[PDB]
Amino acid sequence: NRMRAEREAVARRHRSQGQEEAEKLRATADYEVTRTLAEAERQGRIMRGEGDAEAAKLFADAFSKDPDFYAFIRSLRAYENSFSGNQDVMVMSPDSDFFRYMKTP
Amino acid sequence: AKLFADAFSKDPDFYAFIRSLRAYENSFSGNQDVMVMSPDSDFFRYMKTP
Amino acid sequence: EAYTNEVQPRANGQAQRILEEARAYKAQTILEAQGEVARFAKLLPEYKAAPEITRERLYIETMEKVLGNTRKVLVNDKGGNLMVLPL
Amino acid sequence: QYIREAEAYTNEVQPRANGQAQRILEEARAYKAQTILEAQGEVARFAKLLPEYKAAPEITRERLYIETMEKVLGNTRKVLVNDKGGNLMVLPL
């Protein structure tokens, strides 16, 4: 039974060593994917910046005319968007700004 | 960091502004994070009578 | 030979992909920007005609929207008590 | 048999450790390559966007601020309660 072991040990070595090389090459493959993924993302940001950068001059002049009214209409819209859900509670009072005609004349 | 340092040293306040804004959405992404606002709060300014 | 000649296509296709992909965002960004720019360029002249009325209507309209969904309390002031009761 | 099986286990695990070593070594290289390239892309965005902000700082800041607030506000539990009444509890889970 001892002879079996010594051959069996060599066998596992030959089997296990081959596995090791797989890991080495497998890892290098992952690096190449990461080299191209980042490269692509870099080119994207460059163009993706020009996009918002190009629109920034448009928004700038459009809202420069009246940034107080733009903030008013935009913030009013933002409230409807933010308060879209029913997870908040508006704790007002019967004399609040909106509740001005809620009192007896 | 070298590229960040040079590209952001051009305007530190603006980089902080843009980076600070981006950080908020990444953290508050979940609804579990509650925000106890107030009507007086600077943002909630146009939600009142004009 | 023929090993490197095939690597380039893979990246070449991906390169043109992002180009068009990012160009679409920029195209949409410009387009959407112009639309929003035109949206405010049409309400501003009419807003200046009647700022108080336009502000009041938008405000009252905006209010009934937020209030329509969010819950309300309408509790009298001068009381420092509430139960956040979150989850 | 315990000794015979033991030698197999020792000889089997040693080559596997070497393979794992390269994987973590290679992953660090990929991280380094990804971070440098990613930084360059972000730098370009900031470089192109910076002049736009300098042209209209208040409008750009206000536009970005309102937009930023809307998203963080939409994904949170707004309260809108007079700060006077600061009587609340955490109720954690």
Author numbering:
A (entry chain XX): 225 to 329
B (entry chain XB): 280 to 329
C (entry chain XW): 269 to 355
D (entry chain XA): 263 to 355
Verbatim from the authors:
In Escherichia coli, each FtsH subunit consists of a transmembrane helix, a periplasmic domain, a second transmembrane helix, and a cytoplasmic AAA module and zinc-peptidase domain. ATP hydrolysis within the AAA modules of FtsH powers substrate unfolding, extraction of membrane-embedded substrates from the lipid bilayer, and translocation of denatured polypeptides through an axial channel and into the peptidase chamber. In E. coli, FtsH partners with two additional proteins—HflK and HflC, which contain SPFH domains, forming a large holoenzyme that extends across the inner membrane and into the periplasm.
We refined a ~4.4 Å resolution cryo-EM structure of the DDM-solubilized complex without imposed symmetry, revealing an asymmetric HflK/C complex resembling a nautilus shell with two internal FtsH hexamers. HflK and HflC share sequence and structural homology and were difficult to distinguish in the 4.4-Å density map of the DDM-solubilized complex. This structure allowed visualization of side chains and unambiguous assignment of ~110 C-terminal residues of 24 alternating HflK and HflC subunits. SPFH domains, present in each HflK and HflC subunit, formed the membrane-proximal sides of the nautilus chamber, but only 21 of these 24 domains could be modeled. The entryway into the nautilus chamber was located near the “missing” SPFH domains, which presumably adopted multiple conformations, or were proteolytically truncated. The final model, which had good geometry, included residues 79–355 for most HflK subunits, residues 1–160 and 191–329 for most HflC subunits, and residues 31–97 of the periplasmic domains of two FtsH hexamers. Notably, however, the bilayer curved inward within the complex, whereas the bacterial inner membrane as whole curves outward. By contrast, following purification of FtsH•HflK/C without overexpression, the nautilus-like cryo-EM structures presented here, which were determined without imposed symmetry, revealed an HflK/C chamber containing one or two FtsH hexamers and an opening that could allow membrane proteins to enter and be engaged by FtsH.
